[PDB]
Swiss-Prot record, chain A:
Pfam family, one: Ribosomal_L28
Keyword Amino-acid biosynthesis included in the entry's annotation: no
Superkingdom classification of source: Bacteria
Family: Belongs to the bacterial ribosomal protein bL28 family.
Organism, as annotated: Escherichia coli (strain K12)
Protein name: Large ribosomal subunit protein bL28
Curated annotation (Swiss-Prot), chain B:
HAMAP family registered for this protein in UniProt: Ribosomal_bL9
Modified residues (N6-acetyllysine): 89
Signal peptide: none
Identification of the protein by name: Large ribosomal subunit protein bL9
Gene name, Swiss-Prot/TrEMBL: rplI
Length: 77, 149
RNA sequence: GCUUGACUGCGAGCGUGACGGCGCGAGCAGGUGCGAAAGCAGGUCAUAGUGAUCCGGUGGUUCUGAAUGGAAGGGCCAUC
RNA sequence: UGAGCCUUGAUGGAAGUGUGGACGCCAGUCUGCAUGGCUUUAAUGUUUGAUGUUCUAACGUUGACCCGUAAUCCGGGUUGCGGACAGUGUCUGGUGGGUAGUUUGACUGGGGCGGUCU
RNA sequence: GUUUAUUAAAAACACAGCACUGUGCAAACACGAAAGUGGACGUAUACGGUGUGACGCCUGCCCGGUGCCGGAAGGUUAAUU
RNA sequence: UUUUGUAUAAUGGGUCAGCGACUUAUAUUCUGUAGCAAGGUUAACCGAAUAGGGGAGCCGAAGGGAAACCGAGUCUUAACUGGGCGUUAAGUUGCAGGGUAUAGACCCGAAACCCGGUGAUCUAGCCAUGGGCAGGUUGAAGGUUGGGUAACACUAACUGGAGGACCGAACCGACUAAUGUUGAAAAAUUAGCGGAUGACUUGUGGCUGGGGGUGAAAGGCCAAUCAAACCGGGAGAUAGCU
RNA sequence: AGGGUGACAGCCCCGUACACAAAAAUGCACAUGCUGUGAGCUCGAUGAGUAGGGCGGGACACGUGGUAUCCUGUCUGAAUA
RNA sequence: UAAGGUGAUAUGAACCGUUAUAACCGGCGAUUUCCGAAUGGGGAAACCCAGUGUGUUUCGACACACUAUCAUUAACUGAAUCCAUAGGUUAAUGAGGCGAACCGGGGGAACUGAAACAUCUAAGUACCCCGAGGAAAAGAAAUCAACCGAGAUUCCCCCAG
């Protein structure tokens, strides 16, 4: 479901609008890559379909901090 | 990405030091394996003391007991005989295994392993310089008096 | 031969156009040229030699300028 | 290997005696290595850009195992392989009747052709 | 053999044979936003695409133009800095 | 009706009876008419609801200049001249009508374009599983014996039974003519005709869905529809034409 | 008011204004009971992958325009009264 | 509430009533087959088959009840692997589907107009999809104003074509 999962960044729509300004309904899908995060504490290697930058989050706002939430919302985890 | 080292690590090791690194190294190796910890502040600006409990507290005023320095100066006179005789000479010798045990019945006691002496005075009788230094820095002084049985 | 009137601002009143426009213009103001002088000169003997608006470009200007002073930008005049 | 920093030279302990380098407008002189009565330009420390190697630890695996599981899917684990490559996101040059929307004037002794639009 | 069911059965299409070209396998390619699937439970004596059309004797000259294949040393050149 | 022009052999109407096309809203400008007048008038809203209150605001009594600004003047200009636009114009608010704007804008009518659904009981390919092919003919390969060979080739007779093989019912198809053409029939009947063990033919069910499918390819077939199916919407598409 | 009754009825009938009517069931207001909720008093704390920025788009009447402001797919990324 | 009644085409029949529920009007409950979210499994809708209990029984066979899925929680279990998770079981509570318009959100046309047509318009309209309520959304300034101040949101009339 091409979803950030960690931030929710979903694919938005738009227009390629080539030169001369021409309607070309397209879409912008997240980076995403899915990783193998080492919770360490829980001693588990939970793999999440995280998106670029959205990763910088786990590496900044905290792993189990994020894993905390997402798990509170009732997401896979 | 800073993170504090925790062991080896090539061109950046200190078993405990903060060095700028790439996130591609952390959460990928430097960490997931037990070799570092992010600059979560909670381990730096809140662990500064912890990561400094051997200098700012120890190595600067560490008086745990290193008072055995000058400690020796006013005692029962460090007169350690050595059996004298023969036209005014001696018999045995005095060095360490005598100055230290000297404080046997004196309750206290010093370690013959803690002293200072350039060379070794031959057979004489003059006060020795068996200075009892509790620690390299804070040393002391100790004498010897080859008495007669 | 001497020159820059191929000037600037306006214009009684006319001609020709459905209109946008276009042509003729004596004379008035300021300042020029030529002539002794009256006077002539607002491009060529005349009728072809041509592009509207928009969007912009360059110069000028206390016209304007979103809290105020500025500025960008906008208007006006010249011009591509 | 470029570029950088500027960290160190060159202008701008005792003589002699020799051993490689320097551009010179040369008849040079220098420059170090042993023996012996601030610019102008290069090296180490360093930073960053280039290409190229090697590694593992992301990442791939439509190799082999183990459990879920008397399952061919899938997930987790093990091992091998490959490995910052491949792949994907955003941006970007090329290509692109495969596809899509349109255009492709008027006069005209019918239309077209020819010619003509001021 | 096939074909315009309802005006054309043919000299049309198809064929076996031929050549060219692509494809090393998670194949090329095709359907599909993706997962996945056909190709194929096949592996270059295989599969796809194109053109020719049994068989016999053959298949000449042209690479200037367009396409495609190889080189990319140099000239011009995108985002970016 | 349409036309320069129609009895026109140009259009439309069998006839009758009923229905059938310049409306509606808001705005703007006039004409008429009513109210008030240098003033006219309210909006929403309130409401002892068609009153009464509310004058937010709108138009008008001033205009010129691109404006700043000025002002019965103001611009243009250096110009205290001329010239342009102004000054000696009553407006305003209803109500009825004419006209315009925005709306489907008198009415009926395309061929098409887009969006979402429904269809492979017809037909085109395919997948799975079953069925059909009277009779008659030809005679390949291979084998057996004789011959033959140094052994093989080779050869003859018999055997054997292949083939998008032959003749021909069923069956599948559809080359010719006639008849039919308000048919018996929205493609057939009759007399001939082509294939008929094959790329054959058929029952049953399944899978491919519209710019997509399927196609031994004709633009053919996708339910009597196909150079883009059918149904429902956008939708009163649009129609300088009739 | 209206309707019906053998033609058009205030007084024939049903109604009509007006006046009352609830075992029970519930909308709604209040009123309170139980549980859950937590008042106010001082001392505090005051929303970071965020605001901004580069790229591509979109929304703002506003077609990038000299164009603020808002949202972001992609890359970054601060102050902290 | 009452002298009349057993709905209609529908009479007839056979009956119930006349003080006091006969009928009839409303409140509340009972029953409420089978299909249909359909929920035990399956399926061409209204049908075919099953398990575990229960029952009758001179206790067979057959009636009846519960058995979908997901989710939150609790309990018991429990792999690769010591632990540990994964997974399994059970229980309870909730969801599921139906809807007329209005509403919030995700996606989003063309005809048309521009007297052609790409910018532009049509229009964020038609349509599709998810979600919620009697309303929804919105809402207590990182708002405007302009040196005076106003004071969350929402709807109306002006500003003004
Ligand atoms: Mg001339
Ligand atoms: Mg085309
Ligand atoms: Mg169009
Ligand atoms: Mg023409
Ligand atoms: Mg044939
Ligand atoms: Mg035909
Ligand atoms: Mg035929
Ligand atoms: Mg051919
Ligand atoms: Mg041929
Ligand atoms: Mg040839
Ligand atoms: Mg005529
Ligand atoms: Mg006429
Ligand atoms: Mg006639
Ligand atoms: Mg009639
Ligand atoms: Mg045959
Ligand atoms: Mg026949
Ligand atoms: Mg035959
Ligand atoms: Mg069938
Ligand atoms: Mg429409
Ligand atoms: Mg119509
Ligand atoms: Mg059931
Ligand atoms: Mg079921
Ligand atoms: Mg048009
Ligand atoms: Mg204030």
């Amino acid at each position: 479901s091409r979803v950030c999962q960690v931030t929710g960044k979903r694919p938005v729509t738009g227009n390629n609008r080539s030169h001369a300004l021409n309607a070309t309904k397209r879409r912008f899908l997240p980076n995403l890559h899915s990783h193998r995060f080492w919770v360490e504490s829980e001693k588990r290697f939970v793999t999440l379909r995280v998106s670029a930058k959205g990763m910088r989050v786990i590496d900044k706002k905290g792993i189990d901090t994020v894993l905390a939430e997402l798990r509170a919302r009732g997401e896979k985890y | 990405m800073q993170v504090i080292l925790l062991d080896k690590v090539a061109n950046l090791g200190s078993l405990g030091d903060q060095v700028n690194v790439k996130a591609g190294y952390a959460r990928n190796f430097l960490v997931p394996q037990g070799k570092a910890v992010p600059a979560t502040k909670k381990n730096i600006e809140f662990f500064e003391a912890r990561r400094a409990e051997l200098e700012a507290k120890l190595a600067e005023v560490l008086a745990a007991a290193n008072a055995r320095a000058e400690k020796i100066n006013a005692l029962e006179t460090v007169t350690i005989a050595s059996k004298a005789g023969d036209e005014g000479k001696l018999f045995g010798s005095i060095g360490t295994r005598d100055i230290a045990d000297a404080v046997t019945a004196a309750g206290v006691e010093v370690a013959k392993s803690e002293v200072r002496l350039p060379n070794g005075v031959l057979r004489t009788t003059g006060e020795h310089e068996v200075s009892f230094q509790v620690h390299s820095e804070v040393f002391a002084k100790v004498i010897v008096n080859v008495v007669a049985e």
